[PDB]
Amino acid sequence: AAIYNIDTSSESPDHYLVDHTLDGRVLFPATGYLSIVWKTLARALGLGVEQLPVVFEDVVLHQATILPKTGTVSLEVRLLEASRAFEVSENGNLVVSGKVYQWDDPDPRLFDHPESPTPNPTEPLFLAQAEVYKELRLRGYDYGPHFQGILEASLEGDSGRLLWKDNWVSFMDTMLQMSILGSAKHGLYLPTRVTAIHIDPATHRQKLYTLQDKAQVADVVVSRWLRVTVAGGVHISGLHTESAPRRQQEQQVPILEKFCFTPHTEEGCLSERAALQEELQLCKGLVQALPSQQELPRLLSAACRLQLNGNLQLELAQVLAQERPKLPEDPLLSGLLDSPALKACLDTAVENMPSLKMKVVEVLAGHGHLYSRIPGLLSPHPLLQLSYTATDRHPQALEAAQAELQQHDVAQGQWDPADPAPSALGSADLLVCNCAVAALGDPASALSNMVAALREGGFLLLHTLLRGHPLGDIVAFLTSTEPQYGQGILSQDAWESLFSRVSLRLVGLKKSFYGSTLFLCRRPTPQDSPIFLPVDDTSFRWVESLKGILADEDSSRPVWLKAINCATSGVVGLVNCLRREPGGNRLRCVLLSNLSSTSHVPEVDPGSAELQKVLQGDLVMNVYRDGAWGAFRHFLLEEDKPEEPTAHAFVSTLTRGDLSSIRWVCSSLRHAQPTCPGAQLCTVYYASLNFRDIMLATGKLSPDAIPGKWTSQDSLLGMEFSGRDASGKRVMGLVPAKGLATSVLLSPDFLWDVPSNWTLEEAASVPVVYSTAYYALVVRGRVRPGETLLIHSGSGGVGQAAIAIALSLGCRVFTTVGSAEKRAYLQARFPQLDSTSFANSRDTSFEQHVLWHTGGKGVDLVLNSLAEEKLQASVRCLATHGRFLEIGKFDLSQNHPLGMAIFLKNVTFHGVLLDAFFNESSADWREVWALVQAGIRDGVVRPLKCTVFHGAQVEDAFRYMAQGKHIGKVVVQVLAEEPEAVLKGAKPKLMSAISKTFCPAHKSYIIAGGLGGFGLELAQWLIQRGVQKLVLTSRSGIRTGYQAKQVRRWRRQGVQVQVSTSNISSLEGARGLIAEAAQLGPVGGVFNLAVVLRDGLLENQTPEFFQDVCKPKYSGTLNLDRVTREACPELDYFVVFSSVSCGRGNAGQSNYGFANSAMERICEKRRHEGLPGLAVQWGAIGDVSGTLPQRMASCLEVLDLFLNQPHMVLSSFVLA
């Protein structure tokens, strides 16, 4: 009863277990159980572990134990010496069981490395430790340093070389890692059963040898033909790994956003919306001549109902349901605040300030309520630190809602705009008022106090209702009792005049269609002589001038970077990085980037008043585009997943195991390139739901369990279907997977013809059930007429098919059903059955029924699908020469035992699996096909009872099937059946489904710098879309074991992968690269991932560094952009990978940000002409600035959305 406590604390000797993290959670190594069992045995025999050669057998792990972050878990070990059995328990729960015993006579010959199947190519390349553990991480294993024991491994992973740190657990776990490395099955697989393990410490010591370094190693060899792993004095055979659930919780949540131009001044922003239009229509109507839930219409209804005209001021001002401060809740009053315009203004303020910290104070927060809306908008900024505070007219105001202020870091204040601000607030960084609902004490006094309270160069943001607009007049008529609120409404020209009187400058103005406006003004700053340094010059020789200018740390003159000769200049990304470096405060950018030649190009000469206006503004960003001055701003991306109308969709669960996530997604059949002899596309009208589909949808069955090569991402729901052939013929088919969709592609050998009398609905239930019944009985069981049969679950589809087949032969059938109604249904459907033919299937009582009613002889043929105890009971029902047809999976998957004594009865035991036909042995499938055809034409085959669900209600169908009350089969009417027999117009009706990315097999795709880190992942992701034509570019070619491994794997699958080594920086190189792709086929898309980086503060930077950094990205994007428009009418994607460094800025990477921004400009230009174009801004890629690295799975998942998303530039990152 040995007891082991596993403590992972730093002091505990088992601290190394912390490094065995799989799927993000620490797990006790499968070999740890072997280690503790070995130690327990050695203690039992009184020997030492090093002196005890041991043998394990039939090791089976019944669950996984999770080592907690804190605390300890006790593992108990019990040994049965007589039976040589052992049992490990956790809180009295079985964990590991098997057999362990001493090895009497160790045989050194056992550990000699077996014959190598390969011809010993002696290839030079091999995976180093870093590459091995990078691949393992990509697969999902996160071993730490203590479990990083593989020094190297061959490309195919058959042989390697492991470290020996005098730890058995690590060594054996490393052996398991080597075994898993060679497998092609993507996913997280863990050991479940091991046939036998032999450990011999003496030969282990003999085998170990020391490299030139003192580290000890031990060669490892993995033989998949023999299913054995040998390394030093250890020998593992018959390992069996099973797919882990792989579901990780609290996954990363990237902040998806778009990056679009935004004019400084804009009016009529909300004109797009309609609810606001209807609200305004209602409001104006109720005022004519002097009925909804919205507060303002309610107030107008109060003003009218109480009295049609001449309403008392008291009643209109004071009345229930209106005196409540619900005015901001009215959609019209909050139209601008909900719009992105507020975010644009806030970002404009945040950009123009030296300190990374913000000090913003709200006034009259009792009514403005901006405190509940401003801080949330600023969460996306990674490093921004905010010091917000809400101030009201009197402390009694905003007395409630304190918890809202508590959740945020908002402080309290008691400043009245009438008087000057208290010293505590001081020179605030930003002032937010919300004059729309809050009542100003007075315009002049409020502005005079606020401007004083605002630091020099600070920003003042105001929201109100401009006088003279219909809404302004409407509000003026009401609230006549609140003269302060009346003072808060003035004409836009009145505001203009008021700003000048207070020596304040307007920089931004967002106006709604109904008069609501969002002013943005900043306190002027002492004018100083600026510097105008042009940057449009190529060769970056201007960098020296800029570096010199910033050298004068004493000098404080503002520095203006001027770019007025290249719409593709990346100065916007340049300044962002510089502002995070010393002397970056003085930086200020002016850019002219008209996307249309016809657009006017203004002059920015110092004399030109146009330049003077922006100089007065003094904004960091001054981007001019088509007669407008604005800048690029980040906005959150719409959450809805884009959908499109299509005729090729399939049903899939977006989130594994969640029936609520079932939805229609676009199918890869949209291209249907492989339409040829040996396959054909068939329209789908009805699709059936089998038990396996429910198991997949519920998540209880892994996709890998389905035989066949399946993409890591793909939908495998549905096996049957009935619908019209490509020629209009009515047919019913059978597919390994993807049956539940609007179309299916299958070989003609799996199609039957629906008889005239049948209907497409009926035929949808025949194929799988009758095919499996015919196979299991006739082909395998070889039933003969007159024999006795036991058919468990007669009410099921397979049960009904088997019953129908058996009766036709004239056989006595015993069947088991779960409830009385099913028994009655069967009795009605099969009159031959009598009362002595039904037994209960939820209980083992059927065993006595069969034995009694057969005189104790038993049955000849058993078609079992039940559980372990039911199965064992069923075996006892077999007669001499019996035959056990088994179609279940639980016992077989679990490898439960079976007493071989039953075979003394001369019985036969069959493992029936229809899935084998799809993979191979299609020659023998035609036998079952002919059987089913004969049964159809001879009347033996009858369609089952079908419950129909429409396509939209597929989730309801899954729910109903899961409940388990159905009798017969459940089908999904994808498309109704036309009365006509043969219809030429077999085109599926257009449907709206989620949009995915798929690539034709007859197009070529280029990935500049594809051999890099992220490049290989992108290439593999594309291959999962069936690219079948790929060109990867790299200056140095293939020079790493990982790259060669991946490339050879792709070539093996049949993809034509080409490595060009043709630079895109030179125009001729780009043209040659494009021409090379055309040889394989027309160019589908080009991806630019080339990058060469040289960091350093601008002082260290030199023109050579800028040229190097911009050579692959800026110049290459220009070239590839020129060569694609000229030579690629077919191409549909022009993707480019920018970085968060630009847009968000990053210290010491000015050249990198410049290159990325200039690159984004090209993509913006291309879209304007309708050509494909997309620049993606990534924060940090994990597996290969205040933001965490982003896992590759999440990166590719996001990339899939962006391809679908319309915006020209998009970004994604993970907050700290």
Ligand X SMILES: NC(=O)C1=CN([C@@H]2O[C@H](COP(=O)(O)OP(=O)(O)OC[C@H]3O[C@@H](n4cnc5c(N)ncnc54)[C@H](OP(=O)(O)O)[C@@H]3O)[C@@H](O)[C@H]2O)C=CC1
636 binds, among a second copy, ligand X, none (CB under 5 to 8 A by kind): none
Whole-Å CA distances, 864 to 870, 942, 1120: 9, 22, 63
Residue 1012, binding choice from a second copy, ligand X, none, Cβ under 5 to 8 Å by partner class: ligand X
Residue whose pair of structure tokens reads 């020629």 in the numeric block: 727
Residue 865 near which of ligand X, a second copy, none (CB within 5-8 Å, type-dependent): ligand X
By CB under 8 A, is residue 82 in contact with a second copy?
yes
* Residue carrying the six token digits 């497998």: 183
> What is the C-alpha separation between 662 and 645, in angstroms, rounded?
18
Pairing mode, strands 1056-1059 and 1133-1139: unpaired
Which of a second copy, ligand X, none binds 82 (CB below 5-8 Å, type-dependent)? a second copy
Q: Does position 119 bind a second copy by CB under 8 A?
A: no
Question: In this chain, which of 855, 1054, 1129, 1170 binds a second copy, going by CB under 8 A?
Answer: 855
Cα 1159 to Cα 1136: distance, rounded to the nearest angstrom: 8
CB of 1067 to ligand X, least distance (A): 13
Site residues for a second copy, window 484-503 (CB under 8 A)? none
Q: Identify the CA nearest to 1077 among candidates 988, 1162, 1005, 984.
A: 1005
Per CB under 8 A, the list member of 251, 538, 880, 992 interacting with a second copy is 880
Spatial CA neighbour of 177 closest among 31, 378, 359: 31
Spot the catalytic one: 173, 725, 891, 1183.
173
Q: Name 1004's bridge partners.
A: 1083
β-strands 85-90, 73-80: how paired? antiparallel
- φ/ψ of 422, rounded to 5, equals -70, 160
Annotated ligand binding at 923? The verdict is no
Task: Give yes or no for a contact between 1002 and 1027, defined as CB atoms under 8 angstroms apart.
Answer: no
Residue 549 annotated as binding? no
Query: Dihedral of CA 97/102/104/109: which sign?
Result: positive
**424 near a second copy, rule: CB under 8 A:** no
Which pairing describes strands 410-413 and 428-432: parallel, antiparallel, or unpaired? unpaired
**242 versus 1132: smaller Cβ distance to a second copy:** 242
Selection from ligand X, a second copy, none that 1033 binds (CB < 5 to 8 A by kind) is ligand X
Spell out the residues 6+ positions from residue 636 whose beta carbon is closer than 8 angstroms to its own. Answer: 255, 256, 257, 343, 380
665 vs 1011, beta carbon nearer ligand X? 1011
Q: Cα separation of 747 and 926, whole Å?
A: 12
Residue 964 makes contact with a second copy by CB under 8 A = no
Nearer to ligand X, 421 or 941 (CB): 941
Residue 292 marked ligand-binding: no
C-beta contacts of 484-489 below 8 A and 24+ residues apart? 484/439, 484/440, 484/441, 484/442, 485/439, 485/440, 487/439, 487/440, 487/441, 487/442, 487/443, 488/435, 488/438, 488/439, 488/440, 488/443, 488/464, 489/464, 489/465
Closest CA to 1209 of 1171, 1162, 1169: 1162
Rg, the chain, Cα only: 37
- Site membership for a second copy, residue 891 (CB under 8 A): yes
By beta-carbon proximity to a second copy, the closer residue of 710 and 884 is: 884
- In the chain, residues preceding a discontinuity (C to N beyond 2.5 A) are 290, 1184
Residue ranges binding ligand X (CB under 6 A): 691, 694, 768-769, 772, 775-776, 793, 795-799, 817-818, 841, 865, 887-888, 912-914, 964, 1008-1009, 1011-1015, 1033-1036, 1063-1065, 1089-1092, 1112, 1137, 1139, 1178-1181, 1184
Annotated binding-site residue? 183: no
Query: Within a 13 Å sphere around the CA of 848, how many CA atoms are in the beta-carbon half?
Result: 4
Q: Looking at beta carbons only, is 134 or 905 nearer to a second copy?
A: 905
Choosing from 20, 198, 469, 910, which is the catalytic residue?
20
> Cβ of residue 1020: shortest distance to a second copy, in angstroms?
27
CB atoms under 10 Å from CB of 816, counted, come to: 28
672: left (phi over 0), alpha (psi -120 to 50) or beta: left
Among 292, 605, 852, 1096, binds a second copy (CB under 8 A): 852
Residue in the shown chain whose Cβ atom is closest to ligand X: 1012
Tokens of 344: 């644009």
Torsion angles phi and psi, residue 1077, rounded to 5: -65, -40
Q: Is 227 in the site for a second copy (CB under 8 A)?
A: yes
Q: 805: annotated binding-site residue?
A: yes
Out of 137, 284, 656, 889, the only residue in the binding site for a second copy (CB under 8 A) is 889
Q: Which is nearer to ligand X, 1091 or 1098 (CB)?
A: 1091
184 binds, among a second copy, ligand X, none (CB under 5 to 8 A by kind): none
Rule CB under 8 A: say whether 881 interacts with a second copy.
Answer: yes
What is the nearest approach in angstroms of ligand X to the Cβ of residue 678?
24
Question: Of these partners, ligand X, a second copy, none, which one is at the site of residue 352 (CB under 5 to 8 Å by kind)?
Answer: none
Please pick, from the candidates 268, 627, 674, 911, the single residue that binds a second copy as defined by CB under 8 A.
911
Torsion angle of C-alpha atoms 957, 963, 966, 969, degrees rounded to 10:
50
User: What DSSP string describes 276-297?
Assistant: HHHHHHHHHHHHTT---SSHHH
Give alpha helix (H) positions in 103-222: 129-139, 168-181, 201-207
Could you give the 3-state DSSP secondary structure of residue 1103? Answer: helix
Asked if 1058 is part of the footprint of a second copy (rule: CB under 8 A), the reply reads no
Least Cβ distance, residue 914 to a second copy (angstroms): 9
Is 212 a residue that touches a second copy (CB under 8 A)? Answer: no
What are the beta bridge partners of residue 993? 644
Alpha-carbon distance of 678 to 715, in angstroms, equals 23
What is residue 852's three-state secondary structure?
helix
How many residues line the site for a second copy (CB under 8 A)? 59
The answer to whether the annotation marks 1213 as part of a ligand binding site is no
d(CA 1101, CA 1108): 11
308 binds, among a second copy, ligand X, none (CB under 5 to 8 A by kind): none
Smaller CB separation from ligand X, 207 or 792: 792
Q: Which of 125, 208, 595, 898 binds a second copy (CB under 8 A)?
A: 898
Cα separation, 1174 vs 1205, whole angstroms? 10
**232-251 footprint of a second copy as x/- string (CB under 8 A):** ------x-------------
User: Which of a second copy, ligand X, none does 696 bind, CB closer than 5 to 8 A by kind?
Assistant: none
Whose Cβ is closer to ligand X: residue 450's or residue 1110's? 1110
CB of 855 to a second copy, least distance (A): 7
- Number of other residues whose CB lies within 10 A of the CB of residue 603: 11
Residue 936 among known ligand-binding residues: no
Residue 97 partner contact from ligand X, a second copy, none using kind-dependent CB cut-offs of 5 to 8 Å: a second copy
Partnered with residue 501 across adjacent β-strands are none
Task: Please state, in angstroms and rounded to a whole number, the distance separating the CA atoms of residues 974 and 990.
Answer: 11
Helix spans in 524-570 (H): 542-551
Minimum Å gap between C-beta 949 and ligand X is 15
108 makes contact with a second copy (CB under 8 A)? no
Whether 671 is catalytic: no
Applying CB under 8 A, which of residues 13, 71, 899, 964 lies at the interface with a second copy?
A: 899
Residue 1013 counted as an annotated binding residue: yes
Of ligand X, a second copy, none, which one sits near residue 114, judging by CB under 5 to 8 A according to partner kind? a second copy
Report the site for a second copy in 919-958 (rule: CB under 8 A): 921
105 in active site = no
Per CB under 8 A, residues contacting a second copy are 78, 80-83, 85, 87, 89, 92-95, 97, 114-115, 117, 193, 195, 224-227, 238, 780, 848, 851-852, 855-856, 876, 880-881, 886, 889, 891-913, 916, 921
Bind-site residues = 789-806, 1004-1019
Annotated binding site for NADP(+): 789-806, 1004-1019
Which residues are known to be catalytic?
Answer: 20, 173
